[PDB]
Ligand binder design. Structure first.
Ligand code: HEO
Ligand SMILES: COC1=C(OC)C(=O)C(C/C=C(\C)CC/C=C(\C)CC/C=C(/C)CC/C=C(\C)CC/C=C(\C)CC/C=C(\C)CC/C=C(\C)CCC=C(C)C)=C(C)C1=O
Ligand SMILES: CCCCCCCCCCCCCCCCCC(=O)OC[C@H](COP(=O)(O)OCCN)OC(=O)CCCCCCCCCCCCCCCCC
Ligand SMILES: CCCCCCCCCCCCCCCCCC(=O)OC[C@H](COP(=O)(O)OCCN)OC(=O)CCCCCCCCCCCCCCCCC
Ligand SMILES: CCCCCCCCCCCCCCCCCC(=O)OC[C@H](COP(=O)(O)OCCN)OC(=O)CCCCCCCCCCCCCCCCC
Ligand SMILES: CCCCCCCCCCCCCCCCCC(=O)OC[C@H](COP(=O)(O)OCCN)OC(=O)CCCCCCCCCCCCCCCCC
Ligand SMILES: CCCCCCCCCCCCCCCCCC(=O)OC[C@H](COP(=O)(O)OCCN)OC(=O)CCCCCCCCCCCCCCCCC
Ligand SMILES: CCCCCCCCCCCCCCCCCC(=O)OC[C@H](COP(=O)(O)OCCN)OC(=O)CCCCCCCCCCCCCCCCC
Ligand code: HEM
Ligand SMILES: CCCCCCCCCCCCCCCC(=O)OCCOC(=O)CCCCCCCCCCCCCC
Ligand SMILES: [Cu+2]
Lengths: 262, 99, 186, 660
């Protein structure tokens, strides 16, 4: 699908992701197309019913054919392996992005069948919805409050797992303003179909400041760990929620619920 | 598990040494943790070999030479996992920290 | 027709499978060794004299089984059942010390239900103890079979396979004392 | 009478589960009444249930496989229906509670009970007859392995009517499957269902690795065996190395669940990641444990119906050995997204991509077999050409997903199920049907019906395409695994196309039954009276129509790589030996099924927390082991009267066949 989320992506990371995919495909085609083609070709030119064919019943070893049947696949895999080394080092989710900004830090908590988001530098949190100005690196810290999930925004870039008692790092960027769907890509129990969130890429920094302004006006607040545990109660298809105040270092406190340090 | 009895008693003596030395080495604290670890590992692998020679009578002839190729094979596989695992998890821990 | 040969080869291959089974628990104890949760560590619960006496009992057991096998190959029945009785008594001493220590642990709130370290410790050492008590059962049933049937073909092949098993138990214990107890007590 | 077990463990409320249970117990009543009408009880007992014949045991292995394929496909069809409906804005009929059970059970069955026994049983059938042996190195072990597989199946099917099955996916990820998050018994069923079954599989792997080395016929150096034995040998090696890992991982998890240990828990020191690392260390060998035997099959067929010698024999054996080795250094690629750095990922992605050259050499040698042959278009070689075409694309997708930067997007998407379905259905199921159509005359004396089999193959291939090739596009547009509700509508069309293909596959499977039926109904006209219904090449074809309980009356002596063909060529292929000799053979035992019954009781008591009966089960099982070691009436001798009788029969049939 050309209009796919992966084949028409909007973040840089996904952009090189797709370029990688297509060069790998067009590299493997060179020995998989001839395979099928020869398969049917021989199936027909050497059907028992044929006569003009040359039927050699004892041709079992040609060093030429062995050479060329070992020589092309080795070359292709050399090239792919070099590409894989380079790209793997060039797209580690835990690696800063080279751009003249200050990345916006977002903290991601995988509550029972919900995505919790904390903006610490802004003192707000939202349930099932985030926003960040396009053309600005976004630094995601990720932890699971319950069972193994996977944070993923397909049309923007890469996914990353989410474990309880551990922190994970991802870096993404959006090349065009719009709304993108993100989901949990690891099964996590009964309401796994409702772990859908919407991520906005505002055109300007203004609109971003306006969305922060909006969140700043909510009647709710996440200040005690009591409210965290109140919200984390099992639930499904949660409506998008905003919170005014936020216990300063609450991400760390969650992670500490399971005692990690070092 | 059949051989001469003299061989079995020699193996007894060698293994008695190759046990007694590490324990004195570690409980009294004779040298540094590096010499300690080196010597205990070395001596362990040497006792394993001594048991597999005198006590297990492991030859390169029996069973068409497949008793050994089996053994060696297992070793490699163990090396592949025990080390591999240790590596993977070790890394996976450092990349899960509150950096 | 020589079926004992293939029986012994197959037991060798099973023992290799067992070596794999054990290496996995070794890797486990490696990955969760310092995974205590504000609890005891290897240096605080391991008393080494105990461990060394257990070792020497097992080593003695391995030697008496070698001598039992030789008594087989010289066609003595009483000799075989004697060396076997002795081996079984030493192995019984081994498991007796092991159960004493494990119970003294759990009765002081240090069972495998307190930290991923104590859990892996119990896994490894109990996996070894289970193999050893299985060998104890095997040894007793084979001994009564020997006493009532003599040094027949089946019994001889069975002695050889039990020999492989006992020697391998001791070989795994060398590693268990080198990597768990010693490397921790350090 | 005790435990967690209650009258409130059966879905009394459920219209769907309860009708299924009623129908299954009615069908059980049905087969029982049928068998006791005929009076085939004693016959079953003394010929099939207690048999130590690799032929009989392989047949029963394949029977279990075929009859659980039905449950597997039932679950697949239901899943497709639920999805095509939830895409359309409809509630559907399968809540998550059930839906998740369904996908867990389906994966488990199709990997452990359909795929595994099919291959293991074809091995059991044809490997001893190929190496020129009378039986396997360990008969009673074969019996016991089969019955451990049966205990596992009985457990995974009891879970359906009493209690539930794991809602965690087929590999039971730790945190979700712990006692905190999944308090119910579904994981426990999963735990003893495989463990017990595993205790069998391992033995079977050990069992064959011995045979293929020790019990060969004199004159067949290892570089003369037929390629199936080579591949089978490679497969056995991997089983021995691989299944201890699964044993210990499931054991640690049952410890976590039953005694409160902290191996993979979240608190108190545990580490979940280690589980994900360990199980895939077993998981990735196992796929190979399946692709390697089927590979052999295709080779054999490629050489039989193309009617020339396999190309690149040495290269094929070295390919399979390299695969065996390299199958232990690629498991990390099943969790590239769990955080490990760039170096671990790069290394393991390389090592996974390096696993491609062997299989590519394999398919090119297969192709150059067909190159200048005479291709007879039998059902089996249709299956083979289709295997080449399908598995090519499947493995290409796989290679592309072995590049970590791409796995970053395509992990767990429908691309993953597309690819791994591709390779399994393409490479595995395709070849197991190829193998049954190839070796059916050697097991019953008649040939399957060609028309219905060709129909089955065409439906299968077209339906697999129209089912799964929309999932490549779907996983490309973001749809992930295991969703069941309020599915995004922009996935509707593709999904509604997928279900269509599933229907097609049903027809193929339906064809299969018809293909079987009209064959047996008409068994008295379509017989293989020589023993060689295809112009074969290997030793199995030198035996009788349905071979004798002892494969050969006089162990053959090999001199070249294809034994039977060169015999057919010198002018000396059916040469009655001069004096026949008593044959020493093993007896039939009812002890194995008894160990297995005690094991079933033990597992079912462990799953419902009935401790006295779990104790009685273990006790009885070990006790029975200790009592079967006492009795020495374990083997008998076949006299020369019977051997002469049977071989006179077969050589009469042969002289009549060369006669007309
Ligand atoms: C039949 C079973 C089977 C087999 C044989 C395979 C064989 C391969 N598999 Fe697949 N796999 C199989 C069933 C699965 N795989 C899986 C998971 C999996 C993953 C990780 C999953 C993820 O991304 O999260 C990768 C990268 C692959 C790639 C491969 C590759 C490269 C091979 C290769 O050995 C095959 C490649 C074959 C080729 C390429 C033949 C064509 C070659 C030609 C024509 C010559 C050209 C030469 C070159 C291109 C070098 N597998 C999973 C996980 C399921 C789950 O997640 O629950 C399953 C079940
Ligand atoms: C979520 O789970 C799932 C669903 O449920 C919602 C689906 O419905 C489905 C539908 C799937 C299917 C219908 C699969 C297709 C099935 C096929 C092809 C049949 C397979 C054929 C076989 C021979 C299976 C092998 C059977 C066995 C080994 C025996 C198993 C024995 C069983 C199940 C016994 C169960 C007995 C009971 C429940 C008795 C209960 C007794 C009582 C309630 C006493 C009450 C009496 C009083 C007086 C109150 C499944 C299974 C899925 O797992
Ligand atoms: C016949 C055989 C019978 C069955 C055999 C059973 C398997 C036996 C395998 C031996 C296990 C080796 C364990 C290595 C030590 C594990 C460990 O914890 O060290 C990790 C080390 C960091 O140091 P650390 O030990 O954690 O701190 C001190 C704690 N007291 O971090 C490191 O860097 C250590 C890495 C060392 C790698 C050791 C690999 C040994 C491979 C042996 C191959 C056997 C085949
Ligand atoms: C490989 C897997 C290894 C298996 C690990 C086994 C884990 C055992 C977990 C034990 C759970 C706690 C059960 C319990 O609370 O039992 C208490 C009771 C105490 O016994 P007590 O009355 O104090 O005195 C008896 C003197 N004979 O009884 C006892 O617990 C004391 C006796 C303990 C027995 C030790 C042997 C078990 C180790 C098996 C290995
Ligand atoms: C849990 C882990 C359980 C691991 C069990 C390990 C099994 C060890 C068997 C190793 C044998 C391999 C070598 C083959 C051999 O030579 O043994 C003898 C016999 C094969 O010779 P055979 O074909 O039987 O000749 C006729 C003799 N009557 O082969 C035999 O060994 C006889 C068959 C004995 C198998 C009995 C298995 C008992 C099952 C207990 C399961 C307990 C489960 C507990 C729950 C955890 C899961
Ligand atoms: C919890 C599970 C606990 C399991 C306890 C197991 C107790 C079993 C003791 C077996 C005693 C009966 C042996 C009878 C015998 O004479 O065997 C001889 C046999 C040689 O072959 P053969 O002459 O043909 O005899 C076959 C007749 N049965 O030789 C044999 O084949 C006997 C093989 C016995 C080997 C048993 C090995 C046990 C290993 C324990 C595995 C535990 C793994 C758990 C860790 C998971 C993590
Ligand atoms: C790999 C193999 C893993 C085996 C796991 C064994 C789990 C033990 C279950 C016991 C759980 C428990 O809490 O004890 C219950 C009861 C009180 O205490 C009891 O008396 C229950 C005794 C259970 C017997 C189990 C025997 C199986 C061998
Ligand atoms: C396994 C089932 C095989 C049963 C034995 C078949 C048999 O003996 O013939 C019975 C029946 C008669 O069919 P015809 O001959 O007339 O044969 C049949 O036509 C019915 C056999 C049904 C088998 C369905 C295969 C699925
Ligand atoms: C009749 C052909 C088959 C169909 C239509 C089919 C269909 C499916 C579907 C729809 C899923 C889940 C898709 C999703 O998660 O969105 C699935 C999962 C799976 N299938 Fe199949 N399948 C078939 C044959 C097989 C075979 C032959 C195997 C042999 C291994 C197999 C093994 C699996 C496994 C392991 C899973 C994953 C289970 C899980 O993740 O919970 N399937 N199948
Ligand atoms: C938990 C329970 C475990 C169940 C174990 C299964 C035990 C069932 C054994 C039934 C076999 C009886 C066959 C007797 C007919 C005969 O040999 O003559 O007359 C005939 O010729 C009928 C032939 C019937 C063939 C049926 C084969 C279907 C299975 C496919 C196997 C094909 C193997 C491909 C090589
Ligand atoms: Cu894999």
């Amino acid at each position: 699908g050309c209009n796919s989320a992966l084949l028409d992506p909007k973040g840089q990371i996904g952009l090189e992701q797709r370029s990688l995919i297509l060069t790998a495909f067009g590299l493997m085609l060179i020995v998989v197309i001839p395979a099928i083609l020869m398969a049917v070709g021989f199936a027909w030119k050497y059907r028992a019913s044929n006569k003009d064919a040359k039927y050699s019943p004892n041709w079992s070893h040609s060093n030429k054919v062995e050479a060329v049947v070992w020589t092309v696949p080795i070359l292709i895999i050399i090239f792919l392996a070099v590409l894989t080394w380079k790209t793997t080092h060039a797209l580690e989710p835990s690696k800063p992005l080279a751009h003249d900004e200050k990345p916006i830090t977002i903290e991601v908590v995988s509550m029972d069948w919900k995505w919790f988001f904390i903006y610490p530098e802004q003192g707000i949190a939202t349930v099932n919805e985030i926003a960040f100005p396009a053309n600005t690196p976004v630094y995601f810290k990720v932890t699971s409050n319950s069972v193994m999930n996977s944070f993923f925004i397909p049309r923007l870039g890469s996914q990353i797992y989410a474990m309880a008692g551990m922190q994970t790092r991802l870096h993404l960027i959006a090349n065009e303003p719009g709304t993108y769907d993100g989901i949990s890509a690891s099964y996590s129990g009964p309401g796994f179909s409702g772990m859908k969130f919407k991520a906005i890429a505002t055109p300007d920094r203004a609109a971003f400041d306006q969305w922060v302004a909006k969140a700043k006006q909510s009647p709710n607040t996440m200040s005690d760990m009591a409210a965290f545990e109140k919200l984390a109660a099992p639930s499904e298809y949660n409506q998008v929620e905003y919170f005014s105040n936020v216990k300063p270092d609450l991400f760390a406190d969650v992670i500490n619920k399971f005692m990690a340090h070092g | 598990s059949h051989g001469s009895v003299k061989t079995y008693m020699t193996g007894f003596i060698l293994s008695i040494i190759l046990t007694v030395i590490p324990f004195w080495m570690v409980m009294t604290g004779a040298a540094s943790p590096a010499v300690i670890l080196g010597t205990i590992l070395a001596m362990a692998v040497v006792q394993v070999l001594v048991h597999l020679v005198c006590f297990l009578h492991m030859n390169t002839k029996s069973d068409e030479g497949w008793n050994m190729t089996a053994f060696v094979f297992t070793v490699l596989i163990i090396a592949i996992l025990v080390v591999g695992s240790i590596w993977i998890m070790w890394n996976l821990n450092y990349n899960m920290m509150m950096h | 027709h020589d079926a004992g040969g293939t029986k012994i080869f197959g037991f060798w291959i099973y023992l290799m499978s067992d070596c794999i089974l054990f290496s996995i628990l070794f890797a486990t104890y490696a990955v969760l060794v310092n995974g205590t949760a504000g609890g005891p560590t290897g240096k605080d619960i391991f008393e080494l004299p105990f461990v060394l006496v257990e070792t020497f009992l097992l080593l003695f057991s391995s030697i008496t089984y070698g001598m039992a096998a030789i008594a087989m190959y010289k066609n003595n029945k009483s000799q075989v059942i004697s060396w076997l009785a002795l081996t079984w008594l030493f192995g019984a001493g081994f498991i007796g010390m092991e159960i004493y220590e494990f119970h003294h642990l759990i009765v002081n709130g240090m069972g495998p239900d307190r930290s991923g370290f104590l859990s892996a410790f119990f896994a490894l050492v109990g996996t070894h103890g289970l193999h050893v008590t299985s060998g104890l059962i095997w040894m007793a049933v084979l001994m009564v079979q020997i006493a009532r049937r003599g040094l027949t073909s089946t019994n001889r092949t069975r002695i050889m396979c039990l020999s492989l098993f006992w020697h391998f138990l001791d070989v795994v214990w060398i590693c268990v004392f080198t990597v768990v107890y010693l490397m921790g007590a350090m | 009478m005790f435990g967690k077990l209650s009258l409130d463990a059966v879905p009394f409320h459920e219209p769907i589960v309860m009708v299924t249970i009623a129908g299954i117990i009615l069908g059980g009543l049905a087969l029982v009444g049928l068998i006791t009408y005929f009076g085939k009880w004693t016959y079953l007992w003394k010929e099939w249930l207690t048999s130590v014949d690799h032929k009989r045991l392989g047949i029963m292995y394949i029977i279990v496989a075929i009859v659980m394929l039905l449950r597997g496909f039932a679950d697949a069809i239901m899943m497709r229906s639920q999805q095509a409906l939830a895409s359309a804005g409809e509630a559907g009929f399968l809540p998550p509670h059930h839906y998740d059970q369904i996908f867990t059970a389906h994966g488990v069955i199709m990997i452990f009970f359909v795929a595994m026994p099919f291959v293991i049983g074809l091995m059991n059938l044809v490997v001893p007859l190929q190496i020129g042996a009378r039986d396997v190195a360990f008969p009673f072990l074969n019996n016991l392995s089969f019955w451990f597989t049966v205990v596992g199946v009985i457990l995974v099917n009891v879970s359906l009517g009493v209690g539930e099955f794991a809602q965690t996916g087929w590999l039971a990820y730790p945190p979700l499957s712990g006692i905190e998050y999944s308090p119910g018994v579904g994981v426990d069923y999963w735990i003893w269902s495989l463990q017990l079954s595993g205790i069998g599989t391992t033995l079977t792997g050990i069992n064959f690795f011995v045979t293929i080395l020790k019990m060969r016929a004199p004159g067949m150096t290892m570089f003369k065996m037929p390629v199936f034995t080579w591949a089978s040998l490679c497969a056995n090696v991997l089983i021995i190395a691989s299944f201890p890992i699964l044993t210990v991982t499931v054991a640690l998890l049952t410890l976590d669940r039953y005694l409160g240990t902290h191996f993979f828990t979240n608190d108190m020191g545990g580490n979940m990641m280690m589980y994900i690392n360990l199980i895939w260390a077993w998981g990735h060998p196992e796929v190979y444990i399946l692709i390697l035997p089927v590979f052999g099959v295709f080779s054999e067929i490629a050489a039989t119906f193309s009617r020339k010698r396999l190309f690149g024999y040495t290269s094929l054996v070295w390919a399979t050995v390299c695969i065996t080795v390299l199958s232990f250094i690629v498991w990390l690629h099943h969790f590239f997204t769990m955080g490990a750095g760039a170096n671990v990922n790069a290394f393991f992605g390389i090592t996974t991509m390096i696993i491609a050259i062997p299989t590519g050499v394999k398919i090119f040698n297969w192709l150059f077999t067909m190159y200048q042959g005479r291709i007879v278009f039998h059902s089996a070689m249709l299956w083979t050409i289709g295997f080449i075409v399908t598995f090519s694309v499947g493995g290409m997708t796989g290679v592309l997903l072995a590049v970590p930067g791409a796995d970053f997007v395509l992990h767990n998407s429908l691309f993953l199920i597309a690819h791994f379905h591709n390779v399994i259905i393409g490479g595995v199921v395709f070849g197991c049907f190829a193998g049954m159509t190839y070796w059916w005359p050697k097991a019953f004396g008649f040939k399957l019906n060609e028309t219905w089999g060709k129909r089955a193959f065409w439906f299968w291939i077209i339906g697999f395409f129209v089912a799964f090739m929309p999932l490549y596009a779907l996983g490309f547009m973001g749809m992930t695994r295991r969703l069941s509700q309020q599915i995004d509508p922009q996935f509707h069309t593709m999904l509604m196309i997928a279900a269509s293909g599933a229907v097609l596959i049903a027809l193929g499977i339906l064809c299969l039954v018809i293909q079987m039926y009209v064959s047996i109904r008409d068994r008295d006209q379509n017989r293989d009276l020589t023993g060689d219904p295809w112009g074969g090449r290997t030793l199995e074809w030198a035996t009788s129509s349905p071979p004798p309980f002892y494969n050969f009356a006089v162990v053959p002596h090999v001199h070249e790589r294809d034994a039977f063909w060169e015999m057919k060529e010198k002018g000396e292929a059916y040469k009655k030996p001069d004096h026949y000799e008593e044959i020493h053979m093993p007896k039939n035992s009812g002890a194995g099924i008894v160990i297995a019954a005690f094991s079933t009781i033990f597992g079912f008591a462990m799953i419902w927390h009935i401790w006295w009966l779990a104790i009685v089960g273990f006790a009885g099982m070990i006790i029975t082991w200790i009592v079967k070691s006492f009795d020495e009436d374990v083997d008998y001798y076949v006299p020369v009267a019977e051997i002469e009788k049977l071989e006179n029969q077969h050589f009469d049939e042969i002289t009549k066949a060369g006669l007309k």
